[PDB]
Design a protein around this nucleic acid. Structure first.
Lengths: 76, 155, 105, 43, 49
RNA sequence: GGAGACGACGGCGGGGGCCCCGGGCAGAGUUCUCUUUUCUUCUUAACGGUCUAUCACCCUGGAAACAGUUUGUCUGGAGAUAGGGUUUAAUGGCCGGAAGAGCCCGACACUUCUGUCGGGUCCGGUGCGCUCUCGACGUCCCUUGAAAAUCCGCGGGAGGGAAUAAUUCUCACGCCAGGUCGUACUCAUAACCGCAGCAGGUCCCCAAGGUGAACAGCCUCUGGUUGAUAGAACAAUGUAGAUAAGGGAAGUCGGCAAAAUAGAUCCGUAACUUCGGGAAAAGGAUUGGCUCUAAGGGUUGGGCACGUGCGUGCGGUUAACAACCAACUUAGAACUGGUACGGACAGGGGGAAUCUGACUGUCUAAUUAAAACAUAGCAUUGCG
RNA sequence: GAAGCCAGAGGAAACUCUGGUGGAGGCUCGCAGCGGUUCUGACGUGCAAAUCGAUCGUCAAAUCUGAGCAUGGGGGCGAAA
């Protein structure tokens, strides 16, 4: 797993061909949001403070990339 | 009806020993019908199988004895069983004292209370066991300072 | 100065006249200790009734809901209700008294 | 109590009989019929 | 000259303060890029084109 | 050329885990009285990123009034101290992984099928503790404590290399592939060997709390057992464990056996001696409980004048002062119970001599453990 | 409590004395382990074709121990019985 700190590099990673899926994890107790994109070798996580612009980053994300919200319970 | 399998399965499911497993003695046939870990989990959820709490081992007497020994009880000759060095090593005491004295001398030299020649002399006196503690070393330093001041006033 | 707020909700056994809220208030007034001393409440701790079988405790010290639950269990044992009434924390600072689960026989 | 050898089972893990609860409340002096203990008890 | 314990502790506090300042500045740079996300995506798409 | 790749032992320092202490939420038990109580959960992997961590190395400079410095006396004109840096080394801090998991609690639903939804999972402290690991030292040797597969660095400069662009880049990302067995269970008072489900034998890790010097003995927690033909009675003689008035070895081949001694603090300790020992020689004084007193530590913190939280130029060593934090030993005193105070447990009887083998060590598995054997030392013989 | 080391007091120096430090030894008390001294011991068609209890020797090394390998009956191995 790798942290991405640059929004430009995160956008290029999300536009990579081997980016199969992506998910959004909301941590309201720490007031933060995590964008996790699954690629071939690594899972890339971008950590942001929760905000309106942090929500509109999903609009700048590619449309063909499937993006899902992480639920409160990880049902098997 | 034999419930050995159910007791073993319930111990594995609950994550405890088989001596902590409680099977309901009024629900023996229903528990006997449970042959899977899923059925055991179902009975645990319904409360027909529970995990008993641990047996008590309190530390209150140990803590009370520790407080009494801290304030100074139970320390007599009738309570000591090891030799004095076995209870408290002279090597540990000497190492602590040397570290205290060297730390104080380092502090004094760095702050400028003593100079480097006096530091070296006091270092070798402390290694040669002149000072019993920090207070004795401090009094020796004060006496040396007074002697140096008297010599400077005379000269 | 920080202020902490506690509710003991005995509304339901109070309505069934099993739990006496006035006696419970008297017990809390005589058993709550500040700096290790009973009868040392003053303005630090205030105990009152807000109606509908509920006891209201205002504390300015570091009084704990675990201590309040411990005193409630002591009162239940004194009134011979410990084997039948349960004190459960339902929300933050609110401890509610209810019956244990009953099986029809 | 047998606390030297084992722990007491918690009260919340044991179902309490309605007859015993009614008898104890009656001995304490509570009108159990006036409060209706029958509708509360599970089956 | 030989430095004292207070001077050494001052140097240590200065180094920790510098590290904290760098971390805060990096977080603010990330926030600024988050504000400018759409232009960044346009630039990435143009570079790919 | 380096790695692989290396003894035993000693203390010291760093880190993980365990143990211990305080607060908080939640749950449980106690509750004649007392107990803001006692107990339980409160966790964070591999793999990565980043910032740091003893040794050592580099730069300035030139040290006697020698200095630096470890518990342990080593280092320095072959360049110390000081100041500033560079680096080997994480089981350290933060972040990704990762809260979505696991764990705890609650509220509903539920013939079963099946569950669903809330709340929380936090903050500190300590150490001659236990265990593993890492580091720097040190001691011992007529003893100096593997090899190979395998991987890397360097010396060399053969080749191969550009603007029709080239690239033979140990960088990042991306593509493809990874065969064969073995894997249950026991590892022992019933799974192995002893003819057996035989009180024998058979190689290893992991190892909690109290007492205490202590993986001693005794009690407890987790986890395991409650398995070894049973019931009744209490004769003789037994086996095992005990006591006994007065005398105290009169017993017996022979003090065999038992009893007595025993921990710790303090006083004191002969002949002989290879000077190292003898020695815990001998012979004495003490030890409970309670309430106090004293001593032994850590961390942080100095006034001006300018430029502006750092740089100089000064000035002062009573910080010999304040604030905060912390643990276990040692000594002294009063009071108090007593038939006992190392109250169980644990735990030398001692002395005067003689013979004998120098000592440590070894052997007759299943009747002899010894003046027997070996040993270091000494002497002889043979061999260029 | 051996060398080495520090301090103090002497001594012209060599050295001498006192207090510390250090941690040597086929040293020592003693737990496990290893061994097997004693007892009118238990057992004596036994739990056992050598076992059981108490007691005892040793316990940082000439200590204990596994696996792999070597030595084979005119032999081997033997701190030697």
């Amino acid at each position: 797993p790798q942290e991405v700190s640059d929004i430009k590099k995160f956008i290029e990673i999300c536009r990579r061909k081997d980016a199969s899926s992506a998910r959004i994890k909301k941590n309201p107790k720490t007031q933060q949001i995590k964008f996790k994109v699954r690629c071939q070798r690594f899972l890339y996580t971008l950590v942001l403070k929760d905000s309106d612009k942090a929500e509109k980053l999903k609009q700048s994300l590619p449309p063909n990339l499937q993006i899902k919200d992480v639920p409160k319970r990880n049902k098997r | 009806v034999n419930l050995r399998t159910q007791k073993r399965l319930a111990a594995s499911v609950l994550g405890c020993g088989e001596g902590k497993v409680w099977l309901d003695p009024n629900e023996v046939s229903e528990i006997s019908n449970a042959n899977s870990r899923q059925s055991i989990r179902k009975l645990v959820a319904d409360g027909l199988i529970i995990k008993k709490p641990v047996t008590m081992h309190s530390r209150s007497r140990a803590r009370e004895l520790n407080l009494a020994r801290r304030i100074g009880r139970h320390r007599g000759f009738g309570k000591r069983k090891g030799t004095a060095d076995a209870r408290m090593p002279q090597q540990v005491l000497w190492m602590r004292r040397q570290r205290v004295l060297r730390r104080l001398l380092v502090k004094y030299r760095a702050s400028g209370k003593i100079d480097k020649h006096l530091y070296h002399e006091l270092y070798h006196l402390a290694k040669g066991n002149t000072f019993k503690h920090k207070r004795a070393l401090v009094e020796h330093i004060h006496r040396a300072k007074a002697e140096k001041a008297r010599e400077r006033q005379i000269k | 100065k920080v202020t902490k707020k506690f509710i003991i909700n005995a509304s339901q056994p109070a309505s069934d006249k099993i739990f006496d809220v006035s006696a419970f208030e008297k017990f809390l007034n005589e058993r709550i200790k500040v700096d290790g001393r009973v009868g040392n409440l003053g303005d630090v701790i205030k105990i009152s009734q807000i109606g509908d079988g509920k006891v209201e405790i205002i504390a300015h010290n570091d009084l704990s809901g675990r201590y309040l639950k411990y005193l409630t269990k002591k009162f239940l044992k004194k009134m011979q209700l410990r084997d039948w009434l349960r004190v459960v924390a339902t929300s933050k600072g609110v401890y509610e008294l209810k019956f244990y689960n009953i099986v029809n026989d | 109590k047998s606390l030297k050898n084992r722990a007491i089972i918690p009260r919340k893990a044991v179902k309490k009989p309605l007859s015993q609860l009614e008898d104890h409340l009656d001995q304490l002096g509570v009108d159990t019929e006036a409060i209706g203990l029958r509708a509360r008890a599970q089956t | 000259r030989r430095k004292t314990k207070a001077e050494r502790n001052r140097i240590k506090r200065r180094k920790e303060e510098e590290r904290k300042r760098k971390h805060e500045e990096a977080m603010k740079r990330k926030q600024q890029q988050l504000e400018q996300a759409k232009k960044i995506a346009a630039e990435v798409e143009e570079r790919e084109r």
